[PDB]
């Protein structure tokens, strides 16, 4: 009786061994897995200069805020914002939308966020624009402050912040 059962089990194992490669082939390719995260060299990024980087098809803004941009960010109160959520994957989801929580370092010098308007996914124009000294969306007229928070327009939420961290003194690991 062992023989007629071992032959069936060995065939079922062989069937399963042949089916699983046919499923796993549809999982993300080795090149898609390699774009899960990227590394940016911010060695030559002075204050005030914006650095746009492609990630998962869409652009990410990496702006080194100046002395004036940080002042307007920390001056806004929590009641003046349309969306009080920070929209950051690093810290908890329940964190408030304070300027100290919208940056990676305690100094609030580096601002990393998705360059994707939450209204319908357009790319806002940077370099100090709009009516709040931040970003302006030309698709429908969404105004953002220097911290990247919605203040006027059809955009419901703030720009999300990806999982970012400084791996060393002059390199940021996005995702």
């Amino acid at each position: 009786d062992f023989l007629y059962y071992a032959t069936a089990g060995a065939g079922a194992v062989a069937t399963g061994a042949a089916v699983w490669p046919l499923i796993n082939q549809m999982n993300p390719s080795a090149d898609v897995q390699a774009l899960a995260s990227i590394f940016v060299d911010v060695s030559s990024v002075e204050p005030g200069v914006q650095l746009t980087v492609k990630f998962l098809g869409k652009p990410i803004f990496i702006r080194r805020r100046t002395e004036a941009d940080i002042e307007l960010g920390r001056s806004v109160q929590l009641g003046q914002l349309v969306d009080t959520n920070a929209r950051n994957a690093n810290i908890d989801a329940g964190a408030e939308a304070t300027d100290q929580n919208r940056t990676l370092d305690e100094a609030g010098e580096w601002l990393v966020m998705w360059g994707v308007c939450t209204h319908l996914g357009c790319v806002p124009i940077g370099g100090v624009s709009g009516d709040f000294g931040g970003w302006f969306c030309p698709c429908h007229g969404s105004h953002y402050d220097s911290a990247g928070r919605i203040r006027k327009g059809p955009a419901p939420e703030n720009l999300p912040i990806p999982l970012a961290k400084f791996i060393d003194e002059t390199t940021i690991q996005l995702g």
């Binding site: 023989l3 071992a6 032959t7 060995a10 062989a14 090149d31 390699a34 990227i38």
Partner: protein
């Protein structure tokens, strides 16, 4: 054309239990970056695979810094930038320099005896062993029939077969009397042209072997993974065949 002679190198990756020598692929990568890259390219090899398993297996930070030396036109922006591991190796800088991504599978080293394929059956295709015979196949002087008739801008090679030959070396019916032919590639390897970190031998023979092994991995990164899969399919099918044999015997025992 046809198939000439080649030096049979005992590569480590040959045979059923063959695996790439990790340190050798690192040396061949150095020889590629410092010599062959000047003219040749690997448009199909991703740079990130230098840290993939079954290969050179470099740390990702070295590959990240290695990719920066290349200048790459961004697919979206259009402005040049430093290369990432996500990018492929550059195209051949020289126009008539063929791409070396798949060179170790695009050339046959062993043929015959009489177009019967018995040699390749026991010796393999001979790709990485043919490249070794081209690099080390540049003699000092040409053959005697070719003295004073070399085409300008070309160089004689023992292994190369698909090149021109002067009429002085052809027989009565167009066939060449020389072993090889004239290739447009100057002799790229010179003794001690590369200084390895661990002071390994850097002779022309040692470099041609290492760069040949590297070029095999570039054509098939998944060589070691394949042979494990091949070994595994043999184990399932060998057991299942033995069980199916005895099952067929007992099942047919009530007839014969």
């Amino acid at each position: 054309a046809g198939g000439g002679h080649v030096e049979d190198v005992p590569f480590s990756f040959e045979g059923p239990f063959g695996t790439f020598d990790q340190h050798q692929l690192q040396r061949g990568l150095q020889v590629y970056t410092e010599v062959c890259a000047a003219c040749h390219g690997m448009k199909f090899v991703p740079i990130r695979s230098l840290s993939e398993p079954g290969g050179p297996e470099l740390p990702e930070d070295q590959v990240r810094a290695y990719a920066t030396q290349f200048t790459v036109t961004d697919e979206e922006t259009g402005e040049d930038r430093e290369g990432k591991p996500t990018d492929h190796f550059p195209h051949s800088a020289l126009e008539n320099a063929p791409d070396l991504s798949l060179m170790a599978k695009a050339r046959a080293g062993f043929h015959g005896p009489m177009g019967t394929g018995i040699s390749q059956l026991f010796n393999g295709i001979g790709g990485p062993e043919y490249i070794y015979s081209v690099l080390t196949g540049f003699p000092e002087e040409p053959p005697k029939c070719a003295e004073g008739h070399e085409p300008d801008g070309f160089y004689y090679n023992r292994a190369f077969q698909n090149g021109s030959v002067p009429d002085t070396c052809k027989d009565a019916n167009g066939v060449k009397t020389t072993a090889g032919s004239w290739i447009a590639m100057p002799p790229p390897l010179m003794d001690d042209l590369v200084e390895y970190a661990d002071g390994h031998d850097a002779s022309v023979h040692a470099m041609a072997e290492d760069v040949s092994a590297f070029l095999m991995w570039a054509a098939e990164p998944k060589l070691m993974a394949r042979k494990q899969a091949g070994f595994t399919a043999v184990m399932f099918l060998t057991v299942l065949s033995v069980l199916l044999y005895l099952t067929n015997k007992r099942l047919w025992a009530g007839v014969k």
